[model samples]
Target chain A: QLNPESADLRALAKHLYDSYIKSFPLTKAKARAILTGKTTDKSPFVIYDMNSLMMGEDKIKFSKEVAIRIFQGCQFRSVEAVQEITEYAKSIPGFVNLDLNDQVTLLKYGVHEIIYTMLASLMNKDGVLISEGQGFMTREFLKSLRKPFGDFMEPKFEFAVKFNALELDDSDLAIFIAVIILSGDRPGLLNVKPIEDIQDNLLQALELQLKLNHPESSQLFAKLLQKMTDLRQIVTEHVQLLQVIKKTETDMSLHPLLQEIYKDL
Target chain B: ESADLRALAKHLYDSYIKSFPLTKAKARAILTGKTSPFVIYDMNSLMMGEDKIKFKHITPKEVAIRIFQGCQFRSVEAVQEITEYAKSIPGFVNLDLNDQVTLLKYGVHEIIYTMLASLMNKDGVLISEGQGFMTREFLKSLRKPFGDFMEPKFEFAVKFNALELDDSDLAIFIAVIILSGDRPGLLNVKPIEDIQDNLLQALELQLKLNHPESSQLFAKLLQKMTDLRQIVTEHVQLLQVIKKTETDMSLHPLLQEIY
Candidate 1:
């Protein structure tokens, strides 16, 4: 609503999505280098040798360290994306005007799902998450790691595989982010109607743009609507996985913000 | 906020009165012949016939049809209640009539299932206007296609019942479901969204005041909506399955529209 026109808002959404893509720390080459054990950048935690650890007797210790590093990378990347999403939401007209509590509630519950949606762009059919820098993680590699930690990534990978098949462009991605953020049904919203009104406009614009951009694909808009349902299902499964992590891995530390969100779940 | 929710809950119950004239407890009492509300018609007993040879008299196809009709009658009644309830919500009736119908068409099943969670407890849902309570195990025993299809929804309802949300909480939740803006083909989304927003605000405030000890209840309630969505998606799939396999069993036109 702040932009001069709906087209301008979309332009801004695309620009923001572009910036988010570039800003992600992991690149395909970097992920490849790290997986190959050639990257010099070290995790603050211990690095596990994937090759020898399986052969040696200290399997438990090796697996734990690998899980820790993988989880650390996930938290780090997610936190960065959360901040970016928060800034973008704040910039939207009328979002900041809602009760402060509502704004926080929306972002806290919303950021993870939105992060996964945007991250859909980075996913390939081979089950890898590609980043801008040297960061990468494959579905095979993540599952091969220890319990709880590796379990978290598997559900997302399954979702990403299906989502990536949709082949949405940056414009579609922006509209989706808006739709996710402006969701009127978020738990603690004090003023849902205005948010719903805003989301309604976004859906309209998204539908129009979809027709214009991909005239031949009449079902694209419907498919996108269905994807929101799919995203909610994935996030639900993600939280269920988080609950398992919380229960079984008592020693494993979670980020304070994530802990806060999980406390309610 | 508590009083407001209480009033809203009462109105919802009053709305439900049009469809189901008796409270579940009362219906149970009558069906058990505790009060003899009327000369009760027991289809299952009638199907048993005078000879009392149940298998010889009733075909599996007839049994299937009977079970199918029983379930559909309950949903049709529920939708009638939902139609009345939606009209009661402020500003809902004020929307364009086509939009109102569209929202109800897309949203009725979801709302029906959400309320079903409240009607249900650990045993199973209240069936036959509460005259009978179908055990979860019994429902599953109806076997395959129709019987097993509702298992997932039953499982969800049991877990949802564990939350122990009161009628007031259910009223607001039902309101939100009916007034959803995400449903496709709305002529105007603003008025519906506006009504739902008020319901959300009121529900949040009510939870804070009503269940102060359970700080996480509100969040848990919202999360259940997501779970409800997943359940409804599966329910729709089950309906499609029914449509394909049960060709002789005609689904009601309203159910067909929803499918």
Candidate 2:
């Protein structure tokens, strides 16, 4: 069980999250391999030599490929992250008090926020987000792409810039992710009070850790709370953009999981 | 023009009561000459008392309970009102029953908060029975936890009120919020979207005629939907805090289902 008072438990949670993140490999190296078809391991995508394919491709096809790759990577990371986070949440004492549907409800609504938060770590101040190994695509470069493809990166980039400014460390990110998941306010939770208690504990523990982590800063914890709102805004815009793409990019395919996520939108 | 708004507002208000009757407890309280469940305090009057002899300090838990109770009451009534309003609209009632419920479940909060903004003046929210206004500062002054729950909403409400929307404009706006077609798990999207398109057409025509003095107000009002989403998110979060912290209080079952 997650013991908020126990530093031992907190460290264990952080360790579990970090290991999951490391296994996913968001670095530029992985992206490069996927793009160049140099990966010995199966590419998450079926498309081969995607990097050169983009250079020689028709405009619409190229745009579709770029969207596919970006979205594929996103979907892959989210699926893995959701499993690991679910495991992590279950370790907390009261998490099981929630029925399976409520648990899935939390995961479904929360995946984007967690994904973007992890993505913030990969963001570079130089206007490019390093997609793990594929190579650095500048913010302007992505926007220069076709309609909906260009629309995706700018809001995410803006969010990353504001979030990265907070300068949260690995520990803060893990706790923050947990806080996002434990939100009791999600529309359909059945046993709200227990989850609410769990979230309240997590917040208090997070604030305590923040105070210890950033002793001189008075507003770090407050800023962290504010970042949750910022994350919500970014995800809201992201979903809207996906809806646009889903309509315009009807010729292109989306992953089943990602499609399900966007189904209602 | 303004009088038209008042008459329509009265009609909508009556429609709400017709659709969702009072709970047995509330009816009984009223019958017994006890205070209505919907009675809200006038901040100064509550503080000074009728003869300046019955001053009382509301506890944080009480404040939280009262705020949520008021929200629950408003939500139930709003759902009823919107359902009735939808039926009266040309095509809304004809949508599939499941889709009808889906739209109601998702759009209830947005519509409730929009109407809440209208109920707000510079001082505070007007409570039931036309009893008195609950000043924003007084609500915020309630002890730790209770007061903070409403801060985001009041913040949004004040800015929204500045738009000076009349009931005619709000009637169209409420329709737009209900027919937004963005709610997840919708069964038949095309039909809902059709209704939304019609709603938007009506809203645009109404806005053009209603607010001719300023061209920007219509666009600004639409932008307020985004602002309302943010406020509702925060409001949900605050409710979560209250649900966790105050164990003695009970959330109405319908409120629990929606929030």
Q: Pick the candidate with the highest DockQ.
A: 1
Kindly report which residue pairs in candidate 1 clash with one another.
A26-A131, A26-A132, A26-A133, A26-A135, A27-A131, A27-A133, A27-A135, A30-A134, A31-A134
Model 1 residue A199 lDDT score: 68
Q: Rate the local accuracy (lDDT) of all candidates.
A: 0.63, 0.61
Per-residue error for B119 in candidate 1, Å, reads 14
Cα error, candidate 2, residue B16 (Å): 33
Q: How close is candidate 1 to the true structure, as a TM-score?
A: 0.49
The residue pairs found clashing in candidate 2 are A26-A132, A27-A132, A27-A133, A28-A132, A28-A133, A29-A133, A31-A133, A31-A134, A32-A133, A32-A134
lDDT (C-alpha) at residue B212 in model 2: 79
Q: lDDT by residue for model 2 over B112-176, one digit each (tens)?
A: 77766665654566545333446677777777677776667777776776666766677767776
Residue range A1-265, candidate 1, lDDT tens digits: 3546767656645654555355444433333344445546621122234653343334222225767756766777676777777776776556788778878878877787888887666555444433333333456776777776656767677677777666677656666676678776676678876776666666656656677677876446645655676677777777777778768877777788766765574
Q: What is the TM-score of chain A alone in each candidate?
A: 0.76, 0.74
Report, for all candidates in order, the number of backbone clashes: 9, 10
Docking class of 2: incorrect
Give one digit per residue, the lDDT tens place, for model 1 in B7-107: 76556645655544544445434434566111112445434331343322123345546566656666776787788778888788888999999989988
